[PDB]
Amino acid sequence: MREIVHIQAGQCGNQIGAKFWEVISDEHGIDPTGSYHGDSDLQLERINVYYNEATGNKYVPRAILVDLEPGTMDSVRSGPFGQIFRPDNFVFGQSGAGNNWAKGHYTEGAELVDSVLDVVRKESESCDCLQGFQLTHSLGGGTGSGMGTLLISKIREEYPDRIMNTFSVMPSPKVSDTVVEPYNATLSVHQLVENTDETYCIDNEALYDICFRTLKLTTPTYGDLNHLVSATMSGVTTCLRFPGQLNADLRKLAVNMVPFPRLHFFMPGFAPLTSRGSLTVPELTQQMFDSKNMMAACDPRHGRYLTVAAIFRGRMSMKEVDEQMLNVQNKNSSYFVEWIPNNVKTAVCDIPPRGLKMSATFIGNSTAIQELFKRISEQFTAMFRRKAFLHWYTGEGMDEMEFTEAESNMNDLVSEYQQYQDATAD
Amino acid sequence: MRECISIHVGQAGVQIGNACWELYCLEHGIQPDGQMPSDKTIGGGDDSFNTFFSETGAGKHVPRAVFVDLEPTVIDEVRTGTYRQLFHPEQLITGKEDAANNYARGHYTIGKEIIDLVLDRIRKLADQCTGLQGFLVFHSFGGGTGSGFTSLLMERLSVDYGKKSKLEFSIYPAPQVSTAVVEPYNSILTTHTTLEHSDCAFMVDNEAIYDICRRNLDIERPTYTNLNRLISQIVSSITASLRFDGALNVDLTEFQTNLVPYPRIHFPLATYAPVISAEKAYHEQLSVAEITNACFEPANQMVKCDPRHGKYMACCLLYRGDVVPKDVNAAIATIKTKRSIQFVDWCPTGFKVGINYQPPTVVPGGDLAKVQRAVCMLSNTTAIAEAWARLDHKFDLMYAKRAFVHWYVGEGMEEGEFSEAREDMAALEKDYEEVG
Amino acid sequence: DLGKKLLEAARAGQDDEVRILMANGADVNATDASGLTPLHLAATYGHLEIVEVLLKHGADVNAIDIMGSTPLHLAALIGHLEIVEVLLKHGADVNAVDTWGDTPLHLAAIMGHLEIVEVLLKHGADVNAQDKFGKTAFDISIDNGNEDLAEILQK
Ligand SMILES: Nc1nc2c(ncn2[C@@H]2O[C@H](COP(=O)(O)OP(=O)(O)OP(=O)(O)O)[C@@H](O)[C@H]2O)c(=O)[nH]1
Ligand SMILES: Nc1nc2c(ncn2[C@@H]2O[C@H](COP(=O)(O)OP(=O)(O)OP(=O)(O)O)[C@@H](O)[C@H]2O)c(=O)[nH]1
Numbered sequence A: 001m002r003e004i005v006h007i008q009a010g011q012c013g014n015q016i017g018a019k020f021w022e023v024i025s026d027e028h029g030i031d032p033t034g035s036y037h038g039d040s041d042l043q044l045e046r047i048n049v050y051y052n053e054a055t056g057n058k059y060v061p062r063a064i065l066v067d068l069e070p071g072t073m074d075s076v077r078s079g080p081f082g083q084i085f086r087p088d089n090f091v092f093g094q095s096g097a098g099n100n101w102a103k104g105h106y107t108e109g110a111e112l113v114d115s116v117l118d119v120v121r122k123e124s125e126s127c128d129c130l131q132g133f134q135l136t137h138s139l140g141g142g143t144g145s146g147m148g149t150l151l152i153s154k155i156r157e158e159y160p161d162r163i164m165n166t167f168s169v170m171p172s173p174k175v176s177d178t179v180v181e182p183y184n185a186t187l188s189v190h191q192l193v194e195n196t197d198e199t200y201c202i203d204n205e206a207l208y209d210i211c212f213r214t215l216k217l218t219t220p221t222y223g224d225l226n227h228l229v230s231a232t233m234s235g236v237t238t239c240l241r242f243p244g245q246l247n248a249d250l251r252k253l254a255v256n257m258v259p260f261p262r263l264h265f266f267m268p269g270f271a272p273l274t275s276r277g278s279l280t281v282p283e284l285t286q287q288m289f290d291s292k293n294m295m296a297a298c299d300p301r302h303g304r305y306l307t308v309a310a311i312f313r314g315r316m317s318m319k320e321v322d323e324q325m326l327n328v329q330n331k332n333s334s335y336f337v338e339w340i341p342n343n344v345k346t347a348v349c350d351i352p353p354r355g356l357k358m359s360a361t362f363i364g365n366s367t368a369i370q371e372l373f374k375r376i377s378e379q380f381t382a383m384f385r386r387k388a389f390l391h392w393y394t395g396e397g398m399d400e401m402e403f404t405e406a407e408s409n410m411n412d413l414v415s416e417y418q419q420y421q422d423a424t425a426d
Numbered sequence B: 001m002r003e004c005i006s007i008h009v010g011q012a013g014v015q016i017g018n019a020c021w022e023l024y025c026l027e028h029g030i031q032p033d034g035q036m037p038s039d040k041t042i043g044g045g046d047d048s049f050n051t052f053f054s055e056t057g058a059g060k061h062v063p064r065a066v067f068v069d070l071e072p073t074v075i076d077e078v079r080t081g082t083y084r085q086l087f088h089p090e091q092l093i094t095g096k097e098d099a100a101n102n103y104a105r106g107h108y109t110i111g112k113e114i115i116d117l118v119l120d121r122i123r124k125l126a127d128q129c130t131g132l133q134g135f136l137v138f139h140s141f142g143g144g145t146g147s148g149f150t151s152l153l154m155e156r157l158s159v160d161y162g163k164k165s166k167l168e169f170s171i172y173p174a175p176q177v178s179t180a181v182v183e184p185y186n187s188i189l190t191t192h193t194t195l196e197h198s199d200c201a202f203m204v205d206n207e208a209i210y211d212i213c214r215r216n217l218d219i220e221r222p223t224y225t226n227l228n229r230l231i232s233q234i235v236s237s238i239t240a241s242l243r244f245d246g247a248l249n250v251d252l253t254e255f256q257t258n259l260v261p262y263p264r265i266h267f268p269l270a271t272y273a274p275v276i277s278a279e280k281a282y283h284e285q286l287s288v289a290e291i292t293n294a295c296f297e298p299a300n301q302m303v304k305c306d307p308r309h310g311k312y313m314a315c316c317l318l319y320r321g322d323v324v325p326k327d328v329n330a331a332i333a334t335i336k337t338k339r340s341i342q343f344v345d346w347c348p349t350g351f352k353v354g355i356n357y358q359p360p361t362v363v364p365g366g367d368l369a370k371v372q373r374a375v376c377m378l379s380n381t382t383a384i385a386e387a388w389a390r391l392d393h394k395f396d397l398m399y400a401k402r403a404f405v406h407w408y409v410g411e412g413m414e415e416g417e418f419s420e421a422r423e424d425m426a427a428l429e430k431d432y433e434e435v436g
Numbered sequence C: 001d002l003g004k005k006l007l008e009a010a011r012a013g014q015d016d017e018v019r020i021l022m023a024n025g026a027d028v029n030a031t032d033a034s035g036l037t038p039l040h041l042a043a044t045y046g047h048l049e050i051v052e053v054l055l056k057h058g059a060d061v062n063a064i065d066i067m068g069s070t071p072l073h074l075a076a077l078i079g080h081l082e083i084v085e086v087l088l089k090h091g092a093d094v095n096a097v098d099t100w101g102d103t104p105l106h107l108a109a110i111m112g113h114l115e116i117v118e119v120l121l122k123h124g125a126d127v128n129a130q131d132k133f134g135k136t137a138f139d140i141s142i143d144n145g146n147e148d149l150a151e152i153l154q155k
């Protein structure tokens, strides 16, 4: 289990995707031209997981860039690491989706899906032992949401034995007050429950709340939100990219984190939280398990953890981490299920991220994520009851029953979380 | 001389195998390139060390061993390590993708891609034997390869080598150093499917070894290197009777006769003493009576359990070093005057004794001090059922909710196999209760 | 049937066509199959100029469709602040209740339209109004952890 094929779709998907590549290239000693300028040998040991080795010892990301809007390719190209991407890997349509999930999934998006798959095949056939795929996208728009889910399903048919992992950005009216976003997110969640193995839930509501209330930023921008996203994506991919006392991969993460197939939506967390251009182990373990440090706007103290994986980065006593992690599980004992023994796993990585000596990343599978799904469901139902803008969807060949089916599946998902939150060992 | 083949499966079996063969080389005077200057017969022989080492016409002594793993990382460390020239390169077999901590992947889907190659390579070693007695199989309970692939391998070895003995060294999981949440599932599935195919199995509880490293060796946070060096010391003590001259446990059949009264209760408890830190080089030398009393203390056991809570069915004491037989007789006589040592009424209350007069060897870089006398006690006691109950309870907590079950069913395994495995464990627990 | 063409023009935002149809006798209070009027459509699709034109030509600012939705409920749901203000200046019932027990306040709170929430409260929206499930707009803010909305409702 080595290589991962990364796909980024739509505006949000490409913006957070570009930031991911900039952050991890800096960690691995890769410059914007593709050359290795690092000093530690630990940076190249598992470089093959995200990069293809090329002529003149040049490292090129195994990244495919997709969007129905052609203007997105230019913003990506104008970035610092915009020239590191392979020119054949850019697949861009002529007209966007205009926040219409039906255009992304059934009409414009369906015309461009065979072209993307051709590039995925070329990247996959050049892998010695492909682990699976990672997609970055928003659920509120039309391309990342509608076309992204179509791509996930088509990849699933061609590679059913490989892992499918998404970094999916959940909408919030605090960042984007577009009323059709709950429709697009609900239709997408219906697809993600069936077709992905693991989804990191990155919530624009929590991202905005952290910038505004914790970082004191009065008018948070996309750049401020994406700083929290890139630190999180760096943290949760640490053990795929660095050796460590574990040989982690996407399938071992799934087998140990997902006890029920539909319950594969993770709540990521990060400590310390910092703003752009701006710590002890017990403090890190504390902050890590605090609602203010979660990237999904849910209070973990309102539910129960089924499973947790934590990654500490930097130089610290491995015995101290074991002691503090043991302490948090004893004093917060009622917030963990009793019927999954030893459900908390820790890893320590020597290399910390940029600008920090200490950092902790949290990956929780908690029943409290039902609060995120209920927030979107209540907004979907408010719009859907009045049939507001429904013609924008049905006019692209969508049946009205697709909405009822997505709503019913999401409410079923919420009920499933509640069932295990109330389950006891006896 | 009757040959023994060792098979090392998955990371735990491979890493413990590396540490064992390093120790065996130091005990027999074999260099990392295979040369043995004390072996006067070049190109072959019928000496006791020949049970574990074949010989080439060039005087190279090669382990009768196979290393198998579904991914290559761990075996690649053996291919490039200190003892890289010792093993037969075709003796180190690796796949490309591991079982992802899933018994069903190791047994039914990924494991099937390499099972025939492994059997053909074992056949080549068996063909070089004049009187093969059987196999020593090393593996974890918790890994997908260690659990699933080992079960598949043990099933095939029973078909192709019907009259040969099979002994296991199994690593029982502990929370302190475990890899996966599903290790209780893998442990119960492999136990169920291997039970009828194994003649004797020595369980090594990672929590027991971890506590000994912390308490006796002053190791704050023991790693796999520290655990494996202690485990290899114990494994060497158990296999010494097969590799040197002696009058106890001289062949695989004798382990079954001496330690296994009935085929299903084939899990002896090993105890070892003394374990002394290397920083205490000038330690006072413990007598035969002191090391012998130490075998009845729960802190020195390889499996966490309380033998005062159970009954003994067999007890063997294997000494190494400066040990006068009359001192063993007197030390044992004092042990018989202790009410917390009860045998079942249907077994003779005797202790079997074997003495090897060479002290144990220490590995350079190890954590152990040199000692002039050491002992390994092997006993079959009903108190080991406590280890099974602990594992069975963790299985029941998850299985009652069917947590993680979908990963096994999705890899060609029926859901009913979990119930059939658990029922077999409930009957195994009752077998210990029926004895006492 | 000019009423049917007036419904289409109000939804599409064709100001000129609305004036022409009204000048030729089109029913400003015509309804589609679900009881939606030209005013409901102009307010749903954000056509401010059409809302003002219809209101000066006899549109019932409190018309209800078959689900009890008024133009104010739709404007508050979709988030058209300027239309909400025009409707309130022309006599819209701030506390009108639809078949789900929802008032305009409930819909603006659900969709996170905080500026509209403030406007409604300033015009006498009832914070104790319960929907068919017993929820007030404050209950919605608490249950969803919307601290910004909860602060506004307490002011
Ligand atoms: N955190 C974050 N959210 C973003 C970013 N860009 C867009 N979004 C959110 O993504 C949603 C809209 O999705 P987009 O990615 O803009 O749309 P798209 O996938 O390009 O689809 P169309 O434009 O309809 O073809 C809204 O919820 C935005 O708030 C970004 O860089 N960061
Ligand atoms: N004592 C000891 N235990 C080990 C060692 N390596 C792994 N373990 C234990 O073995 C279990 C995990 O199984 P592994 O052997 O790593 O897995 P595997 O057989 O390679 O199987 P997959 O990786 O799942 O294909 C856990 O209970 C670990 O603590 C080792 O070197 N020594």
Ligand SMILES: COc1ccc(/N=N/c2cc(OC)c(OC)c(OC)c2)cc1O
Residues within 6 Å of the ligand: A235, A236, A237, A238, A239, A240, A248, A249, A250, A252, A253, A256, A257, A307, A308, A309, A310, A311, A342, A343, A344, A345, A346, A347, B178, B179, B180, B181
């Ligand atoms: C509850 O039990 C467990 C849960 C998860 C387990 N490990 N899973 C991983 C996999 C990773 O790869 C992405 C990690 O990188 C982010 C990773 O970082 C620590 C851990 C293992 C478990 O026994």
Ligand SMILES: [Ca+2]
Residues within 6 Å of the ligand: B039, B040, B041, B042, B043, B044, B045, B046, B055
């Ligand atoms: Ca010889």
Ligand SMILES: [Mg+2]
Residues within 6 Å of the ligand: A010, A011, A069, A096, A097, A141, A143
């Ligand atoms: Mg766009």
Ligand SMILES: [Mg+2]
Residues within 6 Å of the ligand: B010, B011, B071, B098, B143, B145
């Ligand atoms: Mg392994």
